[PDB]
Symmetry: D2
Subunit: 360 residues, 4 copies
Amino acid sequence: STINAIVTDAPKGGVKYTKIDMPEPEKYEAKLKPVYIGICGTDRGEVAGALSFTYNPEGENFLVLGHEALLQVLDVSDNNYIKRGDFVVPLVRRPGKCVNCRIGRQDNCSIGDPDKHEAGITGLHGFMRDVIYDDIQNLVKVNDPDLGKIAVLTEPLKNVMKAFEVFDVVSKRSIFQNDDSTFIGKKMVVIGSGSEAFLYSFVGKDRGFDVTMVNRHDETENKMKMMDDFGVGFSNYLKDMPDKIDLLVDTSGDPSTIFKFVKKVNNNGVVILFGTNGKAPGYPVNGEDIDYIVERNITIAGSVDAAKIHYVQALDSLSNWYHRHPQTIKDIITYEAKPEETNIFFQKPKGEIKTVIKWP
Amino acid sequence: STINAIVTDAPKGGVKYTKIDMPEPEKYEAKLKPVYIGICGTDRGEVAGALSFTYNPEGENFLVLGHEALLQVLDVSDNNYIKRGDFVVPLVRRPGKCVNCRIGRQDNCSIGDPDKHEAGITGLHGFMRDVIYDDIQNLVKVNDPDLGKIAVLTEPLKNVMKAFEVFDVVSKRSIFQNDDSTFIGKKMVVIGSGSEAFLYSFVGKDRGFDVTMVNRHDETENKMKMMDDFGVGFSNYLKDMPDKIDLLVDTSGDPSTIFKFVKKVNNNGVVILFGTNGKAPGYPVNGEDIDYIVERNITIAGSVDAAKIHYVQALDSLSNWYHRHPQTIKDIITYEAKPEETNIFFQKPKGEIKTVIKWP
Amino acid sequence: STINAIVTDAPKGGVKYTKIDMPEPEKYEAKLKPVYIGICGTDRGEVAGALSFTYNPEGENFLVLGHEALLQVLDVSDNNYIKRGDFVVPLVRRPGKCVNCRIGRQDNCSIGDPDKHEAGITGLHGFMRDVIYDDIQNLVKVNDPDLGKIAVLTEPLKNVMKAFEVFDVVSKRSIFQNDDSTFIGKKMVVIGSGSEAFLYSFVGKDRGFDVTMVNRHDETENKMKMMDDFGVGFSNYLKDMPDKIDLLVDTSGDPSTIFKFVKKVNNNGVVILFGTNGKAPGYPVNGEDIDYIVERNITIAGSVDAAKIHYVQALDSLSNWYHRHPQTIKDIITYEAKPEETNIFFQKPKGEIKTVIKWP
Amino acid sequence: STINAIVTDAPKGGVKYTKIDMPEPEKYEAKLKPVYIGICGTDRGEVAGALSFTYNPEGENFLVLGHEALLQVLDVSDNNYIKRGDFVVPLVRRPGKCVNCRIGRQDNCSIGDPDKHEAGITGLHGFMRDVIYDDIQNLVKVNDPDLGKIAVLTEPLKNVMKAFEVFDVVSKRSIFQNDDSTFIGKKMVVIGSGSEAFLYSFVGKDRGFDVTMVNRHDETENKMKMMDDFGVGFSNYLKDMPDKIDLLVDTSGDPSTIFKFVKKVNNNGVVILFGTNGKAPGYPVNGEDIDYIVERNITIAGSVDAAKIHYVQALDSLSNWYHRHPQTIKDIITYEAKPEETNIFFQKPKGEIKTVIKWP
Ligand SMILES: [Zn+2]
Ligand SMILES: [Zn+2]
Ligand SMILES: [Zn+2]
Ligand SMILES: [Zn+2]
Ligand SMILES: [Zn+2]
Ligand SMILES: [Zn+2]
Ligand SMILES: [Zn+2]
Ligand SMILES: [Zn+2]
């Protein structure tokens, strides 16, 4: 069977909305269709040919892009969980055979490649294509009927849910809370201000943190209004440098910013490294920096990807925010594009939060 | 009264053995004297004037040095735990008022200076003087009467015990062990080879790791034998660079070395930053270094001090080790100096691991 | 000054809505008045004279009842959290000196009476009175303006939240989840059909469990509709006895019912004991029952009270629930009484879930 | 092949030392013989036909007994850990495919019989036989050459190390320690005085608890000195009942004794149920009993088996105990039987703590 799809040639790079030949399967559990698809710097990165670990599935010449999906079930085997017309989010990372992979924690794989594989990124076709085939275990059912396009933010949000679990593990080193058991006054600072930063901030707000997003420039008003709505502050760190940080999260991947901010972190502080950029210039870390970290019992936790449970938590969080802030949540999506507007892979509008592809 | 002591002028530096007027405090439960005091880079740093966070007590001009102590109780009020003639190890760090301090976790003080104080380093008189006064709760009784001078290693070891608690805490983020529940074949690498590296390595072996100590040069036969006695490996990383590290503990405090090794750490790897050196040159950390740490879910934790429980577990490990390998344990204590010999704070004795001051 | 208050003579019994002496205190940060006050088996129990561990404050021959409050501020010392006009839920348990009390976990006090105290129960006037004095610290702000009278359910729900933390802690002894990381299909059974049962059920659903409430009698349509709306099931256990239980929660206090459901619990199951009935009769537990608990690595855990963080967390779940389902959440509050209707402390009003007192 | 073995008919019972025909499988990594085999209640029970959950391996009309083994490697494929001549302790319980089994925590199997199987007990041949084939990974190496026969206590001790993990996991629901961070004066009571109860007491001593073993009768003078030499107290609870218990361990399996001691447990106290007895009578558990558990936040945790890591810990503790109290440790082994002495499965030889069979 022949369909439309947005493909790349991984890692060489490039983008193309074209038609490819998809065969059928033998014994398939599920047939699905895209409805919305989100995009982040990973996609623009793949297209730029800036990612050195990505590849096409074995034997093939191309890779179908897209990992942030919101699908609908075209057909399924009988099961207690989903049926035709239900809406689902698909799992990006699939398990291998390592001690972590065999228990649904492929996000914490002990080998790396090629034990596990990410859809749209590493040797496994993504979701920007008219027809998709999968197993029910890999699908996370959207139970909230009112969510609509908002559900597509599940994929990006689950990364934050995992990272926050990693926080909960590692903050058990000491008592992070107050005298009274609470997070009140506790300070989170999120580097950057794109969708991820937003999600990170929203969740920290749920967790009781006082949250400030930050950048090396003033932001657009839509973003400013968004941060305002949810009780999130903002600071241009060239004008006003936030001090006394309890939880620091980097979505930038930039060492100068990271470590500059690392030096503002309080005793028992936790820093989460999430954002990545292979090209970022080196920043000189010295004896005093390491001493700073050590003398304060600080933890720097790199975090990547997530387990299925974290997709469930992501969806339940989007429900809570929807029914409390319907409008402004809607406005996390800052542009909706047809599949042939491939310019979105190369462009970077001021004001962007999330860009999605409404699928025909 | 007038007593003899070895003192410095914190943070400026220098040392002397001399008489000082030490007034008997207002309240106290215990009156003691030293038997042995160990020294390390901290003591030497204090004297070199290389530490800017140190300071003499209030109203006073000098600072009695010494944190690594083994004392004998001269007199003590009636209690259930210690009797006159008992030997004990004193707490370095004393609690302030924060939420970690007030539960006995001043090692994880939420404020830092000046909520917590450390005897001999920060505004609190150390243990190289004739008479010392204290509270019973701040004294850790030595139960094993065979340890003698070995008990003086309680202080340096307790920092290792806390660094291992931290490993136990942050390792719960994934499943670290093999799929048989054990740590067998899991590669622990320790940068450096001094007293702290040894203590690390011995505890690491007790925890079930394959342990390799490393340095930028080959080691003495005497130290090799000691290592070999505990089944600990040694490698010159300029002649044979270890790879696939699961637990990395640095005692150098050197950024370039720290990050060179970080780049060999496996998925789910944990890096303990322990060793500090403010004057260590700057190493440029780039976007790939950050990405490495991110894609591998690696945790970098800095660790300082310990709780009283860690002293208790330190003493017990010394007991287990001494009764298994008396000779190797004796071999750590490589010189027994008199107080008059203040030069030991300036020049490093021939083949040092642990230098100690026997107190008259 | 003279105020109105509902009061008892504890532990003796009885209740009256009367007038009382209230001297304006010296030391107070805040001045509040009740808006709504809820009641439960505890309130009836005190009034019935059935709780032998309750008592009046020192040198007073009455105890103002009421522990489940929604208050409004009248005057407050300057501070960045709460202002005149704000609504707040007061803390019930107050901390003493123990190692858990001093870190805001009076909930887990390690001493019991008289190191800790509960408003309305043990030595501390409750909240059914015209004027309350308190400290800012003991008050939790309600930030959701739509919540109104639904916030009064905070005190009951925070006990659930704590029990789930208890579950979250003890369930770490093994891997409780599916090999997909999820709780999908994990069976939760709540003994009882009361307000507490419902609260647990809703939290359990939020947690991913299949949840079933059980009583020894059939239920109403008012109640069943409410359960259905939240995806919660119901079964009369005389007609159908649930099996294969992963998390059992008892709100009844009845041995016979507890241990009968205990013997339907899976390997690694957790049982939460929450409800209390000192008057419930013995049920013979034999060695075979014990062996059953052992061989399945089952945990049986008592949970009482909660910490401030669990109030905050409670309030946040109620907004979530109210905003997803305003109907059935309104439907929890089955009667609004005036203070003079002191008959609600003797007779279960008709079809009760939660009886509140709307204050003048 | 035809070899000597001690066998039963599970579950009917019965025992004899005889000749049997054991095949060698098409796959195995190691070939071993026994050196020492321990016996406990489970063996005696098996013989009496008191355990209907026991059964012979698939296709066989008999069950080779014995699960507490010290074996020696006769031949083993090349590997980095064990060689011909080394002494090992074989794994009892072997995993299936449940989420816990597949990561080497078959001790916490989510399914039970038959995911998992125990050697000498459930569908898997035991260790009282001339020749044993196994895979390397089911073997745990004895690295202390001095331990000799004492290494046979590994199997009953590892059950103690796992129950202490359980205690560690569940005592995290609050702060269990004193406010100095220690366990000093924390009160451990162990019900019973058998081998299992000694093992619990010594580990408890290492963990910092003040420990007492109890029974409903006086104990032998030899037992008393052994206790005394480790600093463990004894008490006849019919003359002197302990109160204010922090850790309670039951090795009896008797309800009446469990629940009357539970009644002496402090706030945040932990109860471990370990001991089993299908024939112990019912004790009537009332709502006061349930109320006492709930009000004190007590946790009652059933514990069975252990992971491989716990066999390594047991081995390490035995080394530590043996090297500091050689005599007391040897006294634990109170009879060394020939395999012809099958009467030991029917009668307990006099003053028994641990009976072992010395294999020829
Ligand atoms: Zn993305
Ligand atoms: Zn894997
Ligand atoms: Zn030192
Ligand atoms: Zn502090
Ligand atoms: Zn209540
Ligand atoms: Zn308390
Ligand atoms: Zn046994
Ligand atoms: Zn299993």
